[PDB]
Amino acid sequence: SVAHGLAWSYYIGYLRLILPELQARIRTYNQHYNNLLRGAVSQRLYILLPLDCGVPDNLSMADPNIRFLDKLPQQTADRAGIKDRVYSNSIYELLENGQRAGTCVLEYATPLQTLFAMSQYSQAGFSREDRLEQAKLFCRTLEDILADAPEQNNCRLIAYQESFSLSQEVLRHLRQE
């Protein structure tokens, strides 16, 4: 299925490559680049999974209580003929009552953008019903993979359907640690 390929590619070409190196990048940030006076960046990669596949490129567009703070040091690797391909991730603060309530590495699962665009291009032969069905199946397959992935406590999938506060959704997952 469409979702089966996208979930395996998200693992093979991304999570399995960056998750083993993420803990070290966060520590390096927390000790060398973070503000001396502010809270540490939390430890896991938080992955947003809107089942409606609405993926703005700016998180502050989805919720103004999610605001960009800084970048981790980037990770590079030679990949499929590209020397020093760059993997970069962004740190966000999460506001509650106008005060910072959390700091974490946060991003949307980019394959949901593919599902959305496929539902929009007639040549893809892919309906909005297909989109919802495959979005769900993508999340479930990714869950399946990560349950047995040796690359373990390194990320958190935040699946949701849409008075909805995305920042409150992330905070609920954050505060479970």
Ligand X SMILES: Nc1nc(=O)c2ncn([C@@H]3O[C@@H]4COP(=O)(O)O[C@H]5[C@@H](O)[C@H](n6cnc7c(N)ncnc76)O[C@@H]5COP(=O)(O)O[C@@H]3[C@@H]4O)c2[nH]1
- The binding site comprises 9, 14, 85-88, 110
Contact call for residue 87 and ligand X (CB under 6 A):
yes
Amino acid, single-letter form, for residue 157: L
Start-to-end CA distance of the chain, whole Å, equals: 35
Contact call for residue 4 and ligand X (CB under 6 A):
no
Check if the beta carbon of residue 44 is closer than 8 Å to that of residue 154.
Answer: yes
Contact call for residue 49 and a copy of itself (CB under 8 A):
no
Of 2 and 171, the one with the shorter C-beta distance to ligand X is 2
Binding-site partner at residue 3 among a copy of itself, ligand X, none, CB < 5 to 8 Å by type: a copy of itself
Contact call for residue 28 and ligand X (CB under 6 A):
no
- Site of tokens 């009552």: 97
Minimum CB distance to a copy of itself, residue 108 (Å): 4
Check if the beta carbon of residue 168 is closer than 8 Å to that of residue 33.
Answer: no
Q: How many residues bind ligand X (CB under 6 A)?
A: 14
Candidate residues 107, 130, 133, 151; the one interacting with ligand X per rule CB under 6 A = 107
Alpha-carbon Rg of the chain, whole angstroms?
A: 17
Q: How many DSSP H helices and E strands does the chain contain?
A: 6, 7
Contact call for residue 114 and a copy of itself (CB under 8 A):
yes
C-beta neighbour count of 78 within 10 angstroms: 9
Residues at the interface with ligand X (CB under 6 A)? 6, 9-10, 13-14, 80, 82, 85, 87, 107, 110-111, 113-114
